[PDB]
Design an enzyme around this catalytic site. Structure first.
Site, PDB file in Angstrom:
ATOM      1  N   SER A 276      -6.856   5.514   6.711  1.00  0.00           N
ATOM      2  CA  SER A 276      -5.715   6.400   6.514  1.00  0.00           C
ATOM      3  C   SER A 276      -5.484   6.666   5.030  1.00  0.00           C
ATOM      4  CB  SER A 276      -4.457   5.791   7.137  1.00  0.00           C
ATOM      5  OG  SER A 276      -3.751   5.003   6.193  1.00  0.00           O
TER       6      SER A 276
ATOM      7  N   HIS B  22      -4.699   4.739  -0.074  1.00  0.00           N
ATOM      8  CA  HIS B  22      -4.187   3.431  -0.467  1.00  0.00           C
ATOM      9  C   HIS B  22      -4.544   3.122  -1.917  1.00  0.00           C
ATOM     10  CE1 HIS B  22      -3.808   2.134   3.955  1.00  0.00           C
ATOM     11  NE2 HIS B  22      -4.247   3.380   3.938  1.00  0.00           N
TER      12      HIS B  22
ATOM     13  N   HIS C 202       0.827  -1.201   0.000  1.00  0.00           N
ATOM     14  CA  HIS C 202       0.000   0.000   0.000  1.00  0.00           C
ATOM     15  C   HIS C 202       0.865   1.257   0.000  1.00  0.00           C
ATOM     16  CE1 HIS C 202       1.274   0.067   4.103  1.00  0.00           C
ATOM     17  NE2 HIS C 202       0.480   1.068   4.436  1.00  0.00           N
TER      18      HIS C 202
END
Length: 163
Positions: free
Chosen positions: A154, A157, A59
């Site tokens: 977060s 990705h 990622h």
């Protein structure tokens, strides 16, 4: 019509002028291209359903302001918002699909996290381990084609995909 009977595990031959020569559109990765997930190499598989054995995918993360890691791996400042952050992802798309660079010079030399240090600071899990927004799309394919712009807690990705 939108199907076929002579292709690798994934992507559906459409060509219904739904954009511009979809040439096999993956309903899982949501990506498009003029070449199957192999490119004169290997496209075997077709066992179960995205669960051939493992994924051990990576990622890029590349997160922006207001998130978790408001700082670049090389720099030390971030302000750009989600929208402006989306562009940072395209970089690993148009450039990677230029038949020039490989899938070993994007997440290893570019990543707003630990990923940009050990090539793939993600490892394998096989669903259940990661979060919802890190299994389904991450289950698409089983080689290293990478799916479109996903959505994770977060950053964003891009799932490099390896196994």
């Amino acid at each position: 019509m939108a199907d076929e009977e002579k292709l690798p595990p994934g992507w559906e031959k459409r060509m219904s002028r739904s954009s511009g020569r979809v040439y096999y559109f993956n309903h899982i990765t949501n990506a498009s291209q003029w070449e199957r997930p192999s490119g004169n190499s290997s496209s075997g598989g077709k066992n179960g359903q995205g669960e051939p054995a493992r994924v051990r995918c990576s990622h890029l993360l590349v997160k922006h302001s207001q998130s978790r890691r408001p700082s670049s791996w090389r720099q030390e400042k971030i302000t750009r918002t989600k929208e402006e952050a989306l562009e940072l992802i395209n970089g690993y798309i148009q450039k990677i699909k230029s038949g020039e660079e490989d899938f070993e010079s994007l997440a290893s030399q570019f990543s707003d996290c630990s990923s940009a240090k050990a090539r793939g600071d993600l490892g394998a899990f096989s669903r259940g381990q990661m979060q919802k927004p890190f299994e389904d799309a991450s289950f698409a394919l089983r080689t290293g084609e990478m799916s479109g712009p996903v959505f994770t807690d977060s950053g964003i990705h891009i799932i490099l995909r390896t196994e």
